[PDB]
Each structure stands twice: as structure tokens, then as C-alpha cells.
Design an enzyme around this catalytic site. Structure first.
Site, PDB file in Angstrom:
ATOM      1  N   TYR B 142     -73.592  -8.268-113.729  1.00  0.00           N
ATOM      2  CA  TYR B 142     -72.871  -9.447-114.201  1.00  0.00           C
ATOM      3  C   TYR B 142     -73.682 -10.452-114.988  1.00  0.00           C
ATOM      4  O   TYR B 142     -73.226 -10.996-115.987  1.00  0.00           O
ATOM      5  CB  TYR B 142     -72.236 -10.090-112.991  1.00  0.00           C
ATOM      6  CG  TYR B 142     -71.401 -11.324-113.235  1.00  0.00           C
ATOM      7  CD1 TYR B 142     -70.111 -11.170-113.675  1.00  0.00           C
ATOM      8  CD2 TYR B 142     -71.913 -12.578-112.995  1.00  0.00           C
ATOM      9  CE1 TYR B 142     -69.318 -12.273-113.866  1.00  0.00           C
ATOM     10  CE2 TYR B 142     -71.123 -13.687-113.194  1.00  0.00           C
ATOM     11  CZ  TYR B 142     -69.817 -13.519-113.624  1.00  0.00           C
ATOM     12  OH  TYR B 142     -68.962 -14.612-113.742  1.00  0.00           O
ATOM     13  N   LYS B 146     -73.275 -11.584-119.070  1.00  0.00           N
ATOM     14  CA  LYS B 146     -73.109 -12.964-119.443  1.00  0.00           C
ATOM     15  C   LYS B 146     -74.359 -13.544-120.106  1.00  0.00           C
ATOM     16  O   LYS B 146     -74.298 -14.517-120.879  1.00  0.00           O
ATOM     17  CB  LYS B 146     -72.746 -13.724-118.203  1.00  0.00           C
ATOM     18  CG  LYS B 146     -71.548 -13.266-117.452  1.00  0.00           C
ATOM     19  CD  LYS B 146     -70.326 -13.516-118.261  1.00  0.00           C
ATOM     20  CE  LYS B 146     -69.051 -13.284-117.402  1.00  0.00           C
ATOM     21  NZ  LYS B 146     -67.884 -13.153-118.256  1.00  0.00           N
TER      22      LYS B 146
END
Ligand SMILES: NC(=O)c1ccc[n+]([C@@H]2O[C@H](COP(=O)([O-])OP(=O)(O)OC[C@H]3O[C@@H](n4cnc5c(N)ncnc54)[C@H](O)[C@@H]3O)[C@@H](O)[C@H]2O)c1
Ligand SMILES: NC(=O)c1ccc[n+]([C@@H]2O[C@H](COP(=O)([O-])OP(=O)(O)OC[C@H]3O[C@@H](n4cnc5c(N)ncnc54)[C@H](O)[C@@H]3O)[C@@H](O)[C@H]2O)c1
Ligand SMILES: NC(=O)c1ccc[n+]([C@@H]2O[C@H](COP(=O)([O-])OP(=O)(O)OC[C@H]3O[C@@H](n4cnc5c(N)ncnc54)[C@H](O)[C@@H]3O)[C@@H](O)[C@H]2O)c1
Ligand SMILES: NC(=O)c1ccc[n+]([C@@H]2O[C@H](COP(=O)([O-])OP(=O)(O)OC[C@H]3O[C@@H](n4cnc5c(N)ncnc54)[C@H](O)[C@@H]3O)[C@@H](O)[C@H]2O)c1
Lengths: 236, 236, 236, 236
Positions: B142, B146
Site C-alpha cells: 500500500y 501511494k
């Protein structure tokens, strides 16, 4: 302190020298790549597919049967490369997928092989690039892939990340290495501002064998000016 | 001042709320997601494929016909999602493949469509996360995703990136959004530290319609405390 | 949780890596040895002397000046060193004198400073040895110098000792630390049973930043089997 | 079964009594101490110095000259003393130094002398202490020193320490001996618990004449309750 090493990107310019010199010193060096490196103690062959999980599982599977319960002293993920392209580009999507497969796929399979095959006190080196410490308008794909890899350092440096006790993650951040290919393609470039492949073998040598090794999480810049290379901390 | 809006990620929790706030103001809204939005002016359907080049070439072909010669005002990239796991987890390669497809595949195509279809002075928003300004050890996949989007946003904000004159790329970086799924997953949580979807939609209209928008390459941390949300910038 | 640290033994193999990681962590590290440490924030230089109270008063005085009214988070005492020989050995009185100087003089001056300079709640680690929990017939001076340090660790853990409230005196009992000189000195040896210095630096870091600190007066054995190092409690 | 004996510390409270009694028996008794004991067959006087090697080489060469070719039958090392003070103290260093000088130096020179002079089957007795089997917070110097002597005694009981075959090293460990100056420093204590010097001359004599001798490296606790005094094994 080092008779065992894994080099991801083993046949590519810099990884190839790491295979050559660690064998000159009788370390067992193994090369993970899309082809065999005949000079390595062994080569693992990466499968061309579009499925990350499919290439990821075959690679982690065959480093499984090759090492068995043998841990390594260092994994050096030096796979990588370049493709330009701004966001308006024709080629943005061809190059982004080339770049993502070359740095974000390889650094994520290597990180996992680190949590499983790597010694406590051992070393994972990640292939960043200093361009990515800021916006790279002319190479979306490149900057994105390497900025992803710099965030990944910070994470493996973190509490409960999977990294073996006392081992480290260090992302090396070059501006331009100096390979025969780079000389061929960038002919009129000042080669004296390119880093020699040897200064990085020298550096991974000191780091692998406890000598002046920098903290986990470290983003180490490699800047050559007129022949003299310099290592400097970057902070994420 | 705006009327034509693209929402990448249109059937998701923030995505649907953007179609609704704006459709009910009579804006033209097209939704791009893997499924249809019956409350949007138009729907583009995302082909499931492991080939990034397959899917990009497709979304860019379908959006390219819908619009023809019409430059839209704003493209909101709000696709995404979440999946945990450190470098040692068994489902890591799967959870990384999701997080890249939802956040790296989608923020790139939206950067491309914005150089092609966006008004001069128009806006692209990308969806990032405050967590990944640091290391994310409990969620390897994740924070790569990002982290790569915050870097892409710095890139589009620069010279010769491909963006149109006066057009801003801005990344919104939430800590947690107040959704039904967050409620049902984190059932015994302090929901007042969550940012209500409606805050972002009220914010997207203000930046979309000229009023109070920040600089291109702005990373805008979204923090909600005891129902009260302030916005604060992060530097890369 | 620790910024100020005193490393008694700051130029030796293990205590050196402690000045490196902790200054790279931007901590205040003051080395205390027979030679200045140029990487440390400070150096107290131990004057060589056969009088215990002369070495002990010049150290307490120079460290007492260097910090003044400030308190430190930790006092790592990793000074020691080694010499062999049984009770019949002609080198017995030389070796014994050096071991009691390297480990009893330095452990007793580090105790005394902790009662005057260790922050309430703080750490003191003493240098011990696993060997000296049983008889050491081939290294009389060593086993008698460490054995006195093990008995000291307990007295500090006792009620009404001088130790700052909430503070811990923990002793570390290694079998073989892996270091430069041990590879040049013990060369056909199995390094897989040798502790990597980078594991004790990380442990010192946990125990100093409050994480998994054992209780005061603990004898922690450090033992490495096949590259995996373990900490087990010893009972005196 | 034994007639030549060295009594280290031979002018002090139990030291004097071993001389007087083994002389009442006509054993040839030599006394080592910092004053001569006129009741013994020959007195060595230890030089008051700071250098361990100076004093240790002087006491070894005088005992060496005195005996020549003569092996002794039992070295009773009963030298020592007592000083107080916990780790924060003012007097900590003075008394640590004093206690090392009295109990660590004297015991290490006894051990070198037993390897050179003790007969096969002979006995070396070292002055240990119950108090120091655990922590001694109020008396740091005293427990370090006596804790050092307990370790030495397992080392000498081990393989190739240099002890003559059949010989033994046994540490004796009191709580309180009934001595004149103990009566002056402690005028109100229940002396029914203070062991009488006598019981240890009676005991040394049995051990010296092979009668019920402990194994080598044994640590004998000597505890007197109200008129009987029991010898019970302690363990390391
Ligand atoms: N001039 C430079 O070489 C330069 C410049 C900036 C940064 N750095 C970066 O540092 C690193 C070292 O430089 P380099 O010259 O050795 O890069 P490189 O391009 O020469 O090496 C590429 C390697 O990756 C391998 N390969 C490609 N994708 C793979 C995959 N998905 N799985 C397994 N193998 C794959 C290739 O076969 C090759 O061995 C690179 O990552 C590079 O991006 C280098
Ligand atoms: N608590 C949170 O939900 C939270 C917190 C921090 C950050 N974020 C981020 O904010 C953004 C929006 O939040 P959200 O909760 O509404 O996410 P969401 O998942 O509910 O909506 C995103 C939609 O994007 C779609 N998307 C996934 N892959 C796609 C693809 N390959 N092509 C096109 N669309 C695809 C999904 O189908 C999904 O419906 C996301 O980027 C999210 O990660 C959310
Ligand atoms: N294999 C090993 O190295 C090993 C094994 C078991 C235990 N240990 C113990 O762990 C500790 C650390 O190991 P190491 O290899 O780093 O020890 P080391 O001998 O390499 O370092 C000791 C350092 O402290 C200094 N020191 C010695 N006397 C001093 C004095 N009087 N005043 C101030 N400093 C003094 C020395 O000059 C030296 O720089 C040591 O105390 C050692 O006894 C080490
Ligand atoms: N209450 C007790 O009597 C008691 C309690 C516990 C342990 N012990 C221990 O048992 C031992 C004998 O008992 P003690 O009461 O008769 O002690 P003591 O003080 O009465 O006599 C010890 C003798 O050893 C000598 N000794 C000190 N320095 C010496 C040196 N540098 N060279 C040679 N000899 C030296 C002293 O001069 C003294 O003559 C002592 O070590 C004592 O600590 C005694």
C-alpha cells in the site's frame, strides 16, 4: 564477513561485475535474471509473464529449492534500467510497464527473499535513483518506480517488517552509472560524472563485511564529479 | 465555474458521492471504474487484464471517443483500496498486485488522460495517503503504491510534464475515510477521527470551480479531529 | 527514546558500532576510552595507571564535567578484552592484572556514574561472559573478572544500591562476537556460531528505546546457532 | 597425614589460630601477611604496593626461596577483610580497591603457589562468603571480590587449571565468624550464630588430613545455629 551472496539482475552491467569479483574472492554468488550468468555459482531464470504473482512465485520457488535452509549474507537487488517519457507521451504506457516490471517488481520479490533467505546482521541493497527525490517530468515511469523503491526502504527499516534481526535495507541512489551501453548511447556525455561499476562493488564489499555500514532505511546518494565519487545521506 | 467532470474510480465510496453531488448540480459526469454507474452521464468500463498496456490503451480509447474534441474541467482519480501485509506475509505478491493495479495503474492513465482531455486552468486530483509519507512496515504494498502517486504528482507539477497551462495536479492524502466498510471492518473505532466523504466532495467542488485551489504538485494531508477536518500540506 | 548515551569502551569492536549507529541516529554519544573516538560527540580519555582510585577519580571527574547537570538515557559499558592462561601460567600475573583493569575497573566506574548521571528509568549494560557462569580453568583472570561483573549486576538490581529509580542494570553474556580481529585471529573457526555486532547494536537500541527491556540484574546469554542469535536468561 | 603448611593472611583472626594450632601439633607452618607472625616457623612479609604484578612477583619469589625443593601440604588462604558502601557512595572506590587488594589479589597469588608447591593430594582453601552468592547492594566492593573468589574456585577445580593431581581447592563461605574485633564492632549481636574460628581449624585439619574432604571446586557454606555448625554445599 561474507561467503554467500544473491545478485538480482546478475547479467546486467553492474550485477555482472558483482558476480565477477565475489567469485574472484571465493564467495558463492548466485544470479537471479531473465538469462543465465555462466560466471555465477548458479543462475535462477526469471519467467517472462505479465502476471506479477506468476513471476514472483516461480522466482521465490526456485530460490527455495536452490538455497534449501542456507541463508545468504547479502541480497543485492541491482536489476533496473531506464526509459524516458513525459505524461503526454506516445510511449508513457509502454515505458511505465517496463519500469514497473524492472524496479517495483524486482525490489518486492527481493524484499521477500530477504525475509526468508537472509542472515541476521545481513544486507539487502535496493536500486533507487536520485532523480526520484523530486519530480521527474520527462520520465514519469522511471521516477514512479524508483520513488516507490525509496518508500519501500523506509518500510523495511520499520518495526515488524519481516527483515531478519539486525540486517539492513539500504537503497543506493545513483545519478548515472558507467556501463559500455551508457557510453554507446550517450556519446558526448562527460563520462567522468558517471560512477564506475567498481566503486559500487567496493562499496557493497565494505557494507557486506561490516565495514562502515549505514543504518537500515538509509537512502545513500552516489554522485561522481570529475572521477571522484561521493556517498551522501538523503532523508525521506 | 465548471461543468464537465471525469471520475476515475466512480462506483467506489468517494466516487459515487462525487457523481451524486455533481449530477444533482447538473454537471456532466462520466464514471470510469470496473462496473457501471447508472447515476452518471456516461460510463466507461475497465477491462480486467494483467496487461497494463492492455487496460491503458483501452481506457484511453473509450474516454477518447466519449469526449472527442471536448476538454473536461476536472479529472478526479479516486480509485484505490487497501491491503495489509509486511514483506514476510504469504499473500504479499497478491496484495501488492492489487494495490498497484488500484493505485499505480489508475493514477498513471488519469495523468495521461489529463494531458490529452483537460482544460487549460483545469484540475487532476490523485488519491494518496498520509501514512506513506513515512515507512509503512505493516503494509509494504500500500505504501509503495501511494508513495509512487505522491512522486507522480510532483512530476506533473513540473516543467514539460505534459499538463495544460494553469492546470493543477494535486494529491489528496487522507488518514481514514468515514465509509460503511471502515465501520464494518473497524467496528469498535473512534469514527470522529474519520474524514466524512462529504468534506472531500465539498472540497473538490471548491478547487474545481476556481475557489481556493492549491498549487500543482501540492500534497494535501486531510485530517479530521472530533468531526473537525483541517487540510495541511506535506513537502516531498 | 534515547538521545544521550555514554559508551564506556567507545573504540573497541562492538562499542564502536554503537558510536556509529547512534550518531547516525543523531544521538549524543560520548566515548570513554584510552583514546578519543573521532565519530563520537565527545571523548573522555582514560589515563593509564596501576592505581584504581586514580583512573576512577579522573573518569568520574571528566565525565562529571562533560555532562554537568544533564542526565543520560544510557551507559553502555562494553569495555573488556581477553587473555588466557591457567593458574600455573607464567603470564598469569600480567594477564590477570589487565583483565581486572579492562573489566572490573570499567564496570565499577560505570556503576558509580549511573547512580550520579543515569536518567531515572535508564539503562546500564555491563559486559559479561557466558563462559564465566561455570569454571574457566584455561583463563583464570578472565573468568574472575567477568564473574565479579555478573555478581555486580545483581547488587545493582538490589534494594538500596544507588541505582536511579526505574533504571536497569542488565549484563550481556556472549560466547563469540564476530569482529575483524576474531576473523584475523581465529580463522578456521565456525562463524555461524558467532554473534554479528549489528544484532547487539539493534538490541541495545530496543532496550534503550524502552522496547523489550529485561529486568534490572538480568544475566542475558547471547548465543548464536547457525546464524540465528538468541537471548536467554541465566540465573546467578 | 600432612606436616608443612602456608597460611596466607596468617597474622589475622582465623589466620593466627591456624598457625597456633598446627604448630601445637608440630606442623611446620609458614605465615604470609604484611607483618610477621612470630608464632609460625617462618614468616613472609607482603609488600604494600599498588602494582598487582610487583606484589605478586615479590610474594611468589620469597615463598619460592623459602621452600626450594619442598612441596607444602595445604595452603589455607584465609586473607581478607570487609568494607561497606553501595554504588553511589563516596568511599566506593577506596573500599573496592582495598577489597580487591585483600581478597582478589591474595587469592590469585595463593592459587599460583598451590600449582608450584602443593603436594599431590594436597589442599588449597580459599575464603569465600554466603552473602555474595546473591547480590550485595550495600557492599559493592566486598561482593565483587568474594564473587571473584567463588568463580576462581570452580576454575581451579577444572581440567588443567595447573593444580597438582589429587589436590583440591575448596572455598569456605561464612556468614559471621566469632572474632574479638567482631565483638567490638557488633556488641549486641546474638553471638550464638557467630561461627567459632575453632570449628574451621578443626575442619581444615580434617580436610588437610583427608578426613571427609569435599570435592575440588566445592563451595562449603558455614552456618552455625545456636551451638551446632553445619557445613552445607552451595552451588554455582
Ligand atoms: N546508469 C545506470 O545503470 C543507473 C542510473 C541510475 C540508477 N541506477 C539504478 O541502479 C541499478 C543498477 O544499475 P544497472 O546498470 O545494473 O541496471 P541494468 O539495467 O543494467 O540491469 C537490469 C537487470 O534487470 C533484469 N531484468 C529486467 N526485469 C527483470 C525482472 N522483472 N526480474 C528479473 N530480472 C529482470 C535484466 O535482465 C538486467 O539484468 C538499476 O536499477 C538502475 O536503474 C543505475
Ligand atoms: N479509509 C479509506 O477508505 C481511505 C483512507 C485513506 C486513503 N484512501 C484512499 O482514498 C481514495 C478513495 O477512497 P475510497 O474509500 O472511496 O476507495 P474505494 O475503493 O471505495 O473506491 C475506489 C474504486 O476504484 C476502483 N478501482 C480499483 N481498481 C481500479 C482499476 N484497476 N481501474 C479503475 N478503477 C479501479 C474500485 O473498483 C473502487 O470501487 C482511494 O485512493 C483510497 O485508497 C481511502
Ligand atoms: N568475541 C568477543 O569480542 C567477546 C566475547 C565474549 C564477551 N565479550 C565481551 O563483550 C565486550 C565487547 O566485546 P569487544 O570485542 O568489543 O571488546 P574489546 O576488547 O574489543 O573493546 C574494549 C575497549 O574498551 C577499552 N577499555 C579497556 N580498558 C579500558 C579502561 N580501563 N578504561 C576505558 N576503556 C577501556 C579498550 O581500550 C577497548 O577499546 C567486551 O567487554 C568483551 O569482554 C567479547
Ligand atoms: N566475620 C568474619 O570473620 C568473616 C565473615 C565472612 C567471611 N570471612 C572471610 O574469611 C577470611 C578470614 O576471616 P578473618 O576474620 O580472620 O579476616 P581478618 O581481617 O581478621 O584477617 C585477614 C588477614 O589477611 C591479611 N590480608 C589482607 N591483605 C593481605 C595482603 N595484601 N597479603 C596477605 N594477607 C592479607 C590481613 O592483613 C589479615 O592479616 C576473610 O577474608 C573474611 O573476609 C570472615
Amino acid at each position: 564477513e561474507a561467503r554467500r551472496v544473491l545478485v538480482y539482475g546478475g547479467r546486467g552491467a553492474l550485477g555482472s561485475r558483482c558476480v565477477q569479483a565475489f567469485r574472484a574472492r571465493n564467495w558463492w554468488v548466485a544470479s537471479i535474471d531473465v538469462v543465465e550468468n555462466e560466471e555465477a555459482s548458479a543462475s535462477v531464470i526469471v519467467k517472462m509473464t505479465d502476471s506479477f504473482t506468476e513471476q514472483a512465485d516461480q522466482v521465490t520457488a526456485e530460490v527455495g529449492k536452490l538455497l534449501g535452509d542456507q541463508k545468504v549474507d547479502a541480497i543485492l537487488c541491482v536489476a533496473g534500467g531506464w526509459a524516458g517519457g513525459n505524461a503526454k507521451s506516445k510511449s508513457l504506457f509502454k515505458n511505465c510497464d517496463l519500469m514497473w516490471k524492472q524496479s517495483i517488481w524486482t525490489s518486492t520479490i527481493s524484499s521477500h527473499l530477504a525475509t526468508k533467505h537472509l542472515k541476521e546482521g545481513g544486507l539487502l541493497t535496493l536500486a533507487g535513483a536520485k532523480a526520484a527525490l523530486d519530480g521527474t517530468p520527462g520520465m514519469i515511469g522511471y521516477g514512479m518506480a524508483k520513488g516507490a523503491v525509496h518508500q519501500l526502504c523506509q518500510s523495511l527499516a520499520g518495526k515488524n517488517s519481516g527483515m531478519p534481526s539486525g540486517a539492513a535495507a539500504i537503497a543506493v541512489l545513483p545519478v548515472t552509472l558507467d556501463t559500455p551501453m551508457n557510453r554507446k548511447s550517450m556519446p558526448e556525455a562527460d563520462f567522468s560524472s558517471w560512477t564506475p561499476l567498481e566503486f559500487l562493488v567496493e562499496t557493497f564489499h565494505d557494507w557486506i563485511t561490516g565495514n562502515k555500514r549505514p543504518n537500515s532505511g538509509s537512502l545513500i546518494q552516489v554522485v561522481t564529479t570529475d572521477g571522484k565519487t561521493e556517498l551522501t545521506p538523503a532523508y525521506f
